[PDB]
């Protein structure tokens with residue numbers, strides 16, 4: 745796939761708002777993922793023990809990790825499609841060490857979209873949401889192709 749420049753603009757315009765509070769958005773997203781799809785929490789050995797949303801909210805380590813995650817994703821989106829390098833180390837650790845199935849990357853994509861829609865309605869109307877969804881599909885498709893080359897296509 746290939747996004748046009750007007751779509752990349754809609755994606756980097758709402759991402760610039762996200763970057764005003766990275767740790768807050770990272771928290772929201774990872775908690776929305778764990779609540780919505782609880783089986784994904786089992787992949788995290790560090791967080792597994794969290795029982796409620798209050799606990800998740802209070803976890804400092806969780807919040808730090810949400811910053812790591814959104815920082816990486818942000819660096820991939822700003823590439824506007826030329827992310828091959830950035831995608832390599834990411835696909836190798838999620839496919840080999842963590843063992844994350846594409847299916848779960850779709851689940852987190854849905855959590856990202858849910859949270860921008862709640863926090864930025866004015867900058868996330870239907871066209872901008874279509875553009876973000878297109879940018880994450882692109883990401884998942886390239887990751888899935890990397891998975892296959894690495895031997896996991898999980």
Ligand code: HEM
Pocket residue numbers: 784785787788789790812813816817833834837838842844848849852
């Ligand atoms: C937007 C997609 C995602 C991004 C950009 C991303 C990024 C990251 C980064 C940058 C780290 C630290 C370095 C590394 O190990 O590679 C990480 C670690 C991790 N990721 Fe992801 N990730 C994503 C999706 C997921 C999903 C969907 C899961 C599980 C449902 C997952 C599970 C984990 C685990 C198990 C670790 C190790 C956490 C810890 O114990 O340190 N990631 N991820």
